[PDB]
Amino acid sequence: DYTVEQFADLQILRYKVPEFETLTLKQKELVYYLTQAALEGRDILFDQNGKYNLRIRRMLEAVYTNYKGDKSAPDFKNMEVYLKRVWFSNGIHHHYGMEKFVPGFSQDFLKQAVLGTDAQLLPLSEGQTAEQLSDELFPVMFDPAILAKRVNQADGEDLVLTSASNYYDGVTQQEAESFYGAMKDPKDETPVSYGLNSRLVKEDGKIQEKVWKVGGLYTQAIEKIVYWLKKAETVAENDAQKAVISKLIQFYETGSLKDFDEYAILWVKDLDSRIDFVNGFTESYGDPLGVKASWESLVNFKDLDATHRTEIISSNAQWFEDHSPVDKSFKKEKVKGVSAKVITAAILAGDLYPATAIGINLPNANWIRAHHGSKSVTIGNITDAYNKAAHGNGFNEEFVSNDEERQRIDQYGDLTGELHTDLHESLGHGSGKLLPGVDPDALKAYGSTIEEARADLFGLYYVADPKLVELKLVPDAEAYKAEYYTFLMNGLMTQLVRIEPGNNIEEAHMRNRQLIARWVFEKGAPDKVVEMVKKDGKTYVVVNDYEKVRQLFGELLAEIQRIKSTGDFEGARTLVENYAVKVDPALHAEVLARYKKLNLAPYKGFINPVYELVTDKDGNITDVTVSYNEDYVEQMLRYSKDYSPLPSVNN
Ligand SMILES: [Zn+2]
């Protein structure tokens, strides 16, 4: 059963760990130790998303598990949904829309609930009462004007002070850009990531950094991570993988950002190990300035059979770059060579739990990828969990135009959808090269939208190529039409189920899909390439010429590749704001009404399996078992009890 529970706008799913039982005992132990190092870092993300998140959580968790009143009352059920969303979003803000949750319960209820809870169980400071803890946390929860956005990206506002994230403390956005612009090296051909694993604070009167390391900030959790990484080091598969674990331990112990670059080099060079993992401060989407990286972790092992399709996409990387529809001046003379593979996720943690991604391209250091290479991974068991949970839910029966399209989607939608993700992560982000002297940050806050659009267009253009039929990546030349329809139907229409009524598209991913869909829709109107007809009051997206759709994909890819490589900022502003922002209220209200009858949640998340060490009668380890019988509430409460080593307050 891939469906666990559904609440609010969130749906909890499960995923299997296929072929885990076939691993050796030394591999199962290495997986176990890496998964343990992953789970210990859950508290690190909560504190990064807000200085009150660890206190608001442990307060609600103490009230939830010790509530004495009627547990079937609307006040308790609405508090239960609130706590579940804080668990899902690793904070009090929406994981996708960045807006703060609105409590569906009164303050008088929570006040009497806190006072009715044992004061010893609440996250009280030294010599603090439950009243003082309520007076400080209630305005954070109930006042809509306090910490309204976890990540702000509005013009004319101090993005550091208007963001509820806890990456800066007592520092203005002007003082942060000047702080790193100064330590910005000039003639440095291998620039370190500056301020990646630290909190920029103003202790006393100086502007300094509190590095996240052993003996420093977040040391209570990092000591646990290093402990399990040392255990994983003793059962490493080979010396290349062992050096990766050892160098990562040094990065945690010293906080040296130079060791992180050395770790990223060794991690890229470890291509032959079956078991791989990510554990550290990786992606910087949580920072409004984009400099600090949130903590995430992923433990996986190579999917041997599924990797052979992604190794054909990699061995033909020069073919896809040469036959690209972009201008010849933007094509790379020789591809950098990306090591692409399909992985089976063993566990999720940090910013990858419970809401995770299906494809990751690392490292982020631009110079490390050029001189040493990158690793592109596709998570097969998560994509499989998405499909089998959505199989037969009747979402396509409601929004697809005709039954003849549904039959093609049911046959090739999973394959071409999974194959499009392979092209996106392994070749979409890596392909193309900027013109000499063009600022890589010339698109400003439009780079994230244009980059994902450029990668989606690369996957869409080539998933239809007749070479993938020659390379036996698709069973026939009609398979791409399933992915083309679902992408257009989602961008033009069905993705609005994730939008609040009266709002526009704000998130970067949802923007590039609508940008690609509406651009092809407008430019294909004279030939009726894509239509949006209505039948009995229901609007359907109709595709009439799938070949012309591909040509329009190439034209938009050539124009987007030109905008990125030449740094045309105002050109990207025209594209993103004219196609990827406006939402039709009449269509949006129609889609929501049709969607509500399906009883589906637009956002998905996964709960991790449960790994157990099997010991003999004398203490030695004989097996490592994996279970899938735990539920959402049980797992979050267990992680809060056994994998929560950080204090409630970290300033
Ligand atoms: Zn991507």
Coordinates of C-alpha atoms in Angstrom, one line a residue, residues 192-607:
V192 CA 35.1 28.4 -1.9
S193 CA 31.4 28.5 -1.1
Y194 CA 31.4 31.5 1.3
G195 CA 29.0 31.4 4.2
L196 CA 27.5 28.0 3.2
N197 CA 27.5 26.3 6.7
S198 CA 27.3 29.1 9.1
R199 CA 24.9 31.6 10.6
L200 CA 25.7 35.3 10.1
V201 CA 25.1 37.0 13.4
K202 CA 26.0 40.3 15.1
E203 CA 27.4 39.1 18.5
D204 CA 28.4 42.2 20.5
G205 CA 29.1 44.7 17.8
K206 CA 30.9 42.6 15.3
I207 CA 29.4 40.9 12.2
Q208 CA 30.7 37.4 12.5
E209 CA 29.7 33.8 11.5
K210 CA 28.7 31.0 13.9
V211 CA 29.9 28.0 12.0
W212 CA 27.8 24.8 12.2
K213 CA 30.3 22.3 13.4
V214 CA 31.4 20.1 16.3
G215 CA 31.9 22.3 19.3
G216 CA 30.0 25.1 17.6
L217 CA 26.5 25.9 16.6
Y218 CA 24.2 22.8 16.2
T219 CA 27.0 20.7 17.8
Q220 CA 24.5 18.6 19.7
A221 CA 23.2 17.1 16.5
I222 CA 26.4 17.1 14.5
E223 CA 28.1 15.1 17.2
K224 CA 25.5 12.4 16.6
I225 CA 26.0 12.6 12.8
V226 CA 29.8 12.3 13.1
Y227 CA 29.3 9.3 15.5
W228 CA 27.3 7.3 12.9
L229 CA 29.6 8.4 10.1
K230 CA 32.5 6.9 12.0
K231 CA 30.6 3.7 12.2
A232 CA 29.9 3.8 8.5
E233 CA 33.6 4.5 7.9
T234 CA 34.5 1.1 9.4
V235 CA 32.2 -0.7 6.9
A236 CA 33.1 1.2 3.8
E237 CA 33.0 -0.6 0.5
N238 CA 36.3 0.7 -0.9
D239 CA 39.0 3.2 -0.2
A240 CA 37.5 5.8 -2.5
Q241 CA 34.2 5.7 -0.6
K242 CA 36.0 5.5 2.7
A243 CA 37.9 8.7 1.9
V244 CA 34.5 10.4 1.2
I245 CA 33.2 9.5 4.6
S246 CA 36.4 10.5 6.3
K247 CA 36.6 13.9 4.6
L248 CA 33.0 14.6 5.4
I249 CA 33.7 13.9 9.1
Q250 CA 36.6 16.5 9.0
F251 CA 34.2 19.0 7.5
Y252 CA 31.8 18.5 10.4
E253 CA 34.5 18.6 13.0
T254 CA 36.4 21.7 11.7
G255 CA 33.7 23.5 9.9
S256 CA 36.3 24.3 7.2
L257 CA 34.6 25.2 3.9
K258 CA 37.8 24.2 2.2
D259 CA 37.3 20.7 3.4
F260 CA 33.8 20.7 1.9
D261 CA 35.3 21.4 -1.5
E262 CA 37.7 18.5 -0.9
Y263 CA 34.7 16.4 0.1
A264 CA 32.9 17.4 -3.0
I265 CA 35.9 16.4 -5.1
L266 CA 36.2 13.0 -3.5
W267 CA 32.4 12.5 -3.6
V268 CA 32.5 13.0 -7.4
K269 CA 35.4 10.7 -7.9
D270 CA 33.5 7.8 -6.1
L271 CA 31.7 6.5 -9.1
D272 CA 32.1 2.7 -8.7
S273 CA 30.7 2.3 -5.2
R274 CA 27.1 0.9 -5.2
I275 CA 26.1 2.6 -2.0
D276 CA 26.2 6.4 -2.2
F277 CA 24.8 9.1 0.1
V278 CA 24.4 12.8 0.7
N279 CA 24.7 14.3 4.1
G280 CA 25.4 18.0 4.7
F281 CA 24.3 21.5 4.0
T282 CA 23.6 21.3 0.3
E283 CA 20.9 23.4 -1.4
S284 CA 20.6 27.1 -0.7
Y285 CA 16.9 27.6 -1.7
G286 CA 16.0 28.3 1.9
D287 CA 18.1 31.5 2.0
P288 CA 16.5 34.6 0.5
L289 CA 20.0 35.6 -0.5
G290 CA 20.9 32.2 -1.8
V291 CA 24.2 31.9 0.2
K292 CA 23.3 29.6 3.2
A293 CA 22.3 26.0 2.4
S294 CA 19.7 24.0 4.3
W295 CA 20.6 20.6 5.8
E296 CA 19.5 17.5 3.9
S297 CA 20.4 13.9 3.7
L298 CA 19.8 11.0 1.4
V299 CA 21.0 7.4 1.7
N300 CA 20.7 5.2 -1.4
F301 CA 22.3 2.4 -3.4
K302 CA 22.6 2.0 -7.2
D303 CA 19.7 0.5 -9.1
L304 CA 21.8 -1.8 -11.3
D305 CA 19.2 -2.6 -14.0
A306 CA 17.6 0.9 -14.2
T307 CA 21.0 2.6 -14.4
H308 CA 21.7 1.0 -17.8
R309 CA 19.1 3.3 -19.5
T310 CA 20.7 6.4 -17.9
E311 CA 24.2 5.3 -19.0
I312 CA 23.0 5.4 -22.7
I313 CA 21.7 9.0 -22.1
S314 CA 25.2 9.8 -20.8
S315 CA 27.3 8.1 -23.5
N316 CA 25.3 10.1 -26.1
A317 CA 25.7 13.4 -24.3
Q318 CA 27.8 14.9 -27.2
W319 CA 25.1 13.7 -29.6
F320 CA 22.4 15.6 -27.7
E321 CA 24.5 18.7 -27.5
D322 CA 25.4 18.7 -31.2
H323 CA 21.8 18.1 -32.4
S324 CA 20.5 20.8 -30.1
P325 CA 18.1 23.3 -31.7
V326 CA 19.9 26.2 -30.0
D327 CA 22.4 28.5 -31.8
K328 CA 25.8 27.0 -32.5
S329 CA 27.5 29.8 -30.5
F330 CA 25.9 28.5 -27.3
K331 CA 26.8 24.8 -27.8
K332 CA 29.5 23.2 -25.7
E333 CA 32.5 22.0 -27.9
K334 CA 33.1 19.1 -25.5
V335 CA 30.6 18.1 -22.8
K336 CA 32.0 18.1 -19.2
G337 CA 30.9 14.5 -18.8
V338 CA 28.3 13.8 -16.1
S339 CA 28.1 10.5 -14.2
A340 CA 24.3 9.7 -14.3
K341 CA 22.7 6.8 -12.5
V342 CA 19.4 5.6 -11.0
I343 CA 19.4 5.2 -7.2
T344 CA 17.1 3.4 -4.8
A345 CA 16.5 5.7 -1.8
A346 CA 17.1 3.9 1.5
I347 CA 16.0 6.8 3.7
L348 CA 15.1 10.5 3.6
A349 CA 16.1 13.2 6.0
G350 CA 16.5 16.9 6.3
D351 CA 15.1 19.0 3.5
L352 CA 14.4 15.8 1.5
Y353 CA 11.9 14.5 4.1
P354 CA 9.0 14.0 3.9
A355 CA 8.7 16.1 0.8
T356 CA 11.6 15.0 -1.5
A357 CA 12.7 15.4 -5.1
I358 CA 13.0 12.7 -7.8
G359 CA 16.3 14.0 -9.3
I360 CA 19.4 15.6 -7.8
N361 CA 22.5 17.1 -9.6
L362 CA 25.5 17.7 -7.4
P363 CA 27.8 19.4 -6.4
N364 CA 26.7 23.0 -6.8
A365 CA 30.2 24.4 -6.9
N366 CA 30.5 25.5 -10.6
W367 CA 34.3 25.0 -10.7
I368 CA 34.3 21.6 -9.1
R369 CA 31.9 20.3 -11.8
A370 CA 34.1 21.6 -14.5
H371 CA 37.5 20.3 -13.3
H372 CA 36.2 17.1 -11.6
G373 CA 32.7 16.3 -12.8
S374 CA 29.2 16.0 -11.3
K375 CA 26.8 13.3 -10.2
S376 CA 23.3 13.2 -11.6
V377 CA 20.9 10.8 -9.8
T378 CA 17.3 9.7 -10.5
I379 CA 15.4 8.1 -7.5
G380 CA 13.6 5.2 -9.1
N381 CA 11.8 3.8 -6.0
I382 CA 10.3 7.3 -5.3
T383 CA 9.2 7.8 -8.9
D384 CA 7.7 4.3 -8.7
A385 CA 5.9 5.2 -5.5
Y386 CA 4.5 8.4 -7.1
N387 CA 3.1 6.4 -10.1
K388 CA 1.7 3.4 -8.3
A389 CA 0.0 5.7 -5.7
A390 CA -1.5 7.8 -8.5
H391 CA -2.4 4.7 -10.6
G392 CA -6.1 4.5 -10.9
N393 CA -7.0 7.6 -8.9
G394 CA -9.1 8.9 -11.7
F395 CA -7.2 12.2 -12.1
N396 CA -6.6 11.6 -15.8
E397 CA -10.2 10.4 -16.3
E398 CA -11.4 13.8 -15.2
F399 CA -9.1 16.2 -17.0
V400 CA -7.8 14.3 -20.1
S401 CA -9.7 15.3 -23.3
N402 CA -10.6 11.9 -24.7
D403 CA -10.3 8.2 -23.8
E404 CA -7.8 7.7 -26.6
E405 CA -5.3 10.0 -24.9
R406 CA -5.8 8.2 -21.6
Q407 CA -5.0 4.9 -23.1
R408 CA -1.7 6.2 -24.5
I409 CA -0.9 7.9 -21.1
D410 CA -1.5 4.7 -19.2
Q411 CA 0.9 2.9 -21.6
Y412 CA 3.8 5.4 -22.0
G413 CA 3.2 8.0 -19.3
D414 CA 5.3 6.4 -16.6
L415 CA 8.2 5.5 -19.0
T416 CA 8.4 8.9 -20.8
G417 CA 7.8 10.7 -17.5
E418 CA 10.6 8.8 -15.8
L419 CA 12.8 9.2 -19.0
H420 CA 12.1 13.0 -19.1
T421 CA 13.4 13.2 -15.6
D422 CA 16.6 11.4 -16.7
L423 CA 17.2 14.0 -19.5
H424 CA 16.4 16.9 -17.2
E425 CA 18.8 16.0 -14.4
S426 CA 21.7 14.5 -16.4
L427 CA 21.8 16.7 -19.5
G428 CA 19.3 19.5 -19.0
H429 CA 21.2 21.4 -16.3
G430 CA 24.7 20.4 -17.7
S431 CA 24.2 21.2 -21.4
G432 CA 25.0 24.6 -22.9
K433 CA 27.8 27.1 -22.0
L434 CA 27.6 30.8 -21.3
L435 CA 29.2 33.3 -23.6
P436 CA 32.6 34.6 -22.3
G437 CA 32.3 37.4 -19.8
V438 CA 28.5 37.0 -19.2
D439 CA 27.6 37.1 -15.5
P440 CA 26.2 33.7 -14.5
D441 CA 23.9 35.6 -12.0
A442 CA 22.7 38.1 -14.7
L443 CA 19.1 36.8 -14.5
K444 CA 18.7 37.7 -10.8
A445 CA 15.6 36.0 -9.3
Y446 CA 14.7 34.7 -12.8
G447 CA 17.7 32.3 -13.0
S448 CA 15.9 29.5 -11.1
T449 CA 12.9 29.8 -13.3
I450 CA 14.8 30.0 -16.6
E451 CA 17.3 27.2 -15.6
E452 CA 14.5 24.7 -14.9
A453 CA 12.6 25.8 -18.0
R454 CA 15.8 25.3 -20.1
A455 CA 16.2 21.8 -18.6
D456 CA 12.5 20.8 -19.0
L457 CA 12.7 22.0 -22.7
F458 CA 15.8 19.8 -23.2
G459 CA 13.9 16.8 -21.8
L460 CA 10.8 17.5 -23.8
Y461 CA 12.6 18.2 -27.1
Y462 CA 14.6 14.9 -26.9
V463 CA 12.0 12.6 -25.4
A464 CA 10.3 13.0 -28.8
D465 CA 13.5 12.4 -30.9
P466 CA 13.5 9.4 -33.2
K467 CA 16.9 8.5 -31.8
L468 CA 15.5 7.4 -28.4
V469 CA 13.6 4.8 -30.4
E470 CA 16.8 3.7 -32.1
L471 CA 18.6 3.6 -28.7
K472 CA 15.6 1.6 -27.5
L473 CA 14.8 4.1 -24.7
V474 CA 11.1 4.1 -25.8
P475 CA 9.2 1.2 -27.3
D476 CA 7.9 3.2 -30.3
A477 CA 7.8 6.6 -31.9
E478 CA 4.4 7.4 -30.3
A479 CA 5.5 7.1 -26.7
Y480 CA 6.5 10.8 -26.3
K481 CA 2.9 12.0 -27.0
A482 CA 1.9 10.8 -23.5
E483 CA 4.5 13.0 -21.8
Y484 CA 3.7 15.9 -24.1
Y485 CA 0.0 15.8 -23.2
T486 CA 0.5 15.5 -19.5
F487 CA 3.0 18.3 -19.4
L488 CA 0.8 20.7 -21.4
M489 CA -2.3 19.7 -19.4
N490 CA -0.5 20.3 -16.2
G491 CA 1.1 23.6 -17.2
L492 CA -2.0 25.1 -18.8
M493 CA -4.6 23.8 -16.3
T494 CA -4.4 21.1 -13.7
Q495 CA -1.4 22.5 -11.7
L496 CA -3.7 25.2 -10.4
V497 CA -5.0 22.8 -7.8
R498 CA -1.9 23.8 -5.8
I499 CA -2.7 27.5 -6.0
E500 CA -4.9 29.4 -3.5
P501 CA -7.9 31.1 -5.1
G502 CA -7.0 34.7 -6.1
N503 CA -3.2 34.1 -6.3
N504 CA -0.8 33.7 -9.1
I505 CA 2.1 31.4 -9.8
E506 CA 5.0 32.2 -7.4
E507 CA 7.1 29.0 -7.0
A508 CA 9.9 28.6 -9.6
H509 CA 9.1 25.1 -10.8
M510 CA 5.3 25.7 -11.3
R511 CA 6.3 28.9 -13.2
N512 CA 8.5 27.2 -15.8
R513 CA 5.8 24.6 -16.6
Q514 CA 3.2 27.3 -17.2
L515 CA 5.8 29.3 -19.1
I516 CA 6.5 26.4 -21.5
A517 CA 2.8 25.4 -21.8
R518 CA 1.4 28.9 -22.5
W519 CA 4.3 29.9 -24.8
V520 CA 3.6 26.8 -27.0
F521 CA -0.1 27.5 -26.7
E522 CA 0.1 31.1 -27.9
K523 CA 2.5 30.5 -30.8
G524 CA 0.7 27.4 -31.8
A525 CA -2.7 29.0 -32.0
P526 CA -2.6 30.0 -35.7
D527 CA -2.3 26.3 -36.7
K528 CA -4.6 25.1 -33.8
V529 CA -1.6 23.1 -32.5
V530 CA -2.9 23.1 -28.9
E531 CA -6.5 24.0 -28.1
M532 CA -8.6 24.3 -24.9
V533 CA -12.2 23.4 -25.8
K534 CA -15.0 22.9 -23.3
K535 CA -17.7 20.2 -23.0
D536 CA -20.6 20.5 -20.6
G537 CA -18.8 23.3 -18.8
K538 CA -15.5 21.4 -18.3
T539 CA -12.4 22.7 -20.1
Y540 CA -10.0 20.2 -21.7
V541 CA -6.6 20.6 -23.3
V542 CA -6.4 19.3 -26.8
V543 CA -3.2 18.6 -28.7
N544 CA -3.7 18.4 -32.5
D545 CA -0.1 18.2 -33.9
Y546 CA 2.5 16.7 -31.5
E547 CA 5.2 17.2 -34.1
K548 CA 4.6 21.0 -34.2
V549 CA 4.7 21.0 -30.4
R550 CA 8.2 19.6 -30.5
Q551 CA 9.3 22.3 -32.9
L552 CA 7.8 24.9 -30.6
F553 CA 9.7 23.3 -27.8
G554 CA 12.9 23.7 -29.8
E555 CA 12.2 27.3 -30.6
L556 CA 11.5 28.2 -27.0
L557 CA 14.6 26.2 -26.0
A558 CA 16.7 28.2 -28.5
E559 CA 15.4 31.5 -27.2
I560 CA 15.8 30.5 -23.5
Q561 CA 19.3 29.2 -24.1
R562 CA 20.1 32.6 -25.8
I563 CA 18.7 34.5 -22.9
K564 CA 20.7 32.6 -20.3
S565 CA 24.0 32.5 -22.3
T566 CA 23.8 36.2 -23.2
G567 CA 22.5 37.4 -19.8
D568 CA 19.4 39.2 -21.2
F569 CA 17.8 40.0 -17.9
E570 CA 15.0 42.2 -19.3
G571 CA 14.3 39.5 -21.8
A572 CA 13.8 36.9 -19.1
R573 CA 11.6 39.4 -17.2
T574 CA 9.4 39.7 -20.3
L575 CA 9.1 35.9 -20.7
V576 CA 8.5 35.0 -17.1
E577 CA 6.0 37.7 -16.3
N578 CA 4.0 37.5 -19.5
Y579 CA 3.5 33.7 -19.6
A580 CA 4.4 32.2 -16.2
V581 CA 2.6 34.5 -13.7
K582 CA -1.0 35.3 -14.8
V583 CA -3.7 32.8 -13.6
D584 CA -7.2 32.8 -15.1
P585 CA -9.6 33.0 -12.1
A586 CA -12.4 31.4 -14.1
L587 CA -10.3 28.4 -15.1
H588 CA -8.7 28.2 -11.6
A589 CA -12.1 28.1 -9.9
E590 CA -13.3 25.4 -12.4
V591 CA -10.3 23.2 -11.8
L592 CA -10.6 23.4 -8.1
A593 CA -14.3 22.4 -8.2
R594 CA -13.5 19.5 -10.5
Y595 CA -10.6 18.4 -8.3
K596 CA -12.4 18.5 -5.0
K597 CA -14.6 15.6 -6.1
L598 CA -11.6 13.3 -6.3
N599 CA -10.5 13.6 -2.6
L600 CA -6.9 14.0 -3.6
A601 CA -4.1 16.2 -2.1
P602 CA -1.9 18.2 -4.5
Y603 CA 1.3 17.9 -2.4
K604 CA 2.9 14.6 -1.7
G605 CA 5.3 13.3 1.0
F606 CA 6.9 10.1 2.0
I607 CA 7.5 8.4 5.4

